[PDB]
Design a protein around this ligand. Sequence first.
Ligand SMILES: O=C(O)/C(S)=C/c1c(Cl)ccc(Cl)c1Cl
Ligand SMILES: [Zn+2]
Ligand SMILES: [Zn+2]
Ligand SMILES: [Zn+2]
Length: 231
Amino acid sequence: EYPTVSEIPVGEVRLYQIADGVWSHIATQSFDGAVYPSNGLIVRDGDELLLIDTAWGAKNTAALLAEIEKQIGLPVTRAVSTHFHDDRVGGVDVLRAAGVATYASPSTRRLAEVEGNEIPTHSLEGLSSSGDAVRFGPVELFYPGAAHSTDNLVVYVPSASVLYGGCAIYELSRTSAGNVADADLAEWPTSIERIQQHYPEAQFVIPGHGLPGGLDLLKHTTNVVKAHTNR
Ligand SMILES: O=C(O)/C(S)=C/c1c(Cl)ccc(Cl)c1Cl
Ligand SMILES: [Zn+2]
Ligand SMILES: [Zn+2]
Ligand SMILES: [Zn+2]
């Protein structure tokens, strides 16, 4: 029932209800002649919504907002980008022009600036050291350490036991490493270990791209990363 890469045409956005007031949003994008899926999260915050990550681009993000307006009908007041790559911050300008307050760690904002990507406005405090956790409305933000990127955060929704690992977590069908240009391969397994240590009760784990599963995705990503390490 979860929408796959092949069912979403580029430009469109699907929403998937996970629990009471917890959705993921799924989009697609073309890169080097191939089509990739991309996940984000939507968490109800009273009568407002917390957005996790853009839909990979200005066009997709504008369509994500229109789809939230149509399907949920509650305002997105804040948004967090979980690291600095285009699939997480591409569309921040759209969010900001819509009146959304955009957030990311100081590291993420700096790395986005250096990369020439869109820069979230607000700086998240309390996430400077590996293992740091901070509450942000209806979710907990967690810096597990460097993994897919030095700045990657993961998001936990306590009300529904939903762990959003972002691009630090691979889907099961991905058996080889993606683009690891900005990754810390040496530390990636340890960082996943921290996620496991801090959210062992997680029932529903969302990767940055592809289908969700359980906590098996953590060990799965460790296997792929270590396999790539021995390439
Ligand atoms: O594998 C991933 O999860 C990501 S975000 C890969 C990537 C990188 Cl490393 C740089 C740039 C862009 Cl656009 C993307 Cl998609
Ligand atoms: Zn990335
Ligand atoms: Zn503001
Ligand atoms: Zn990604």
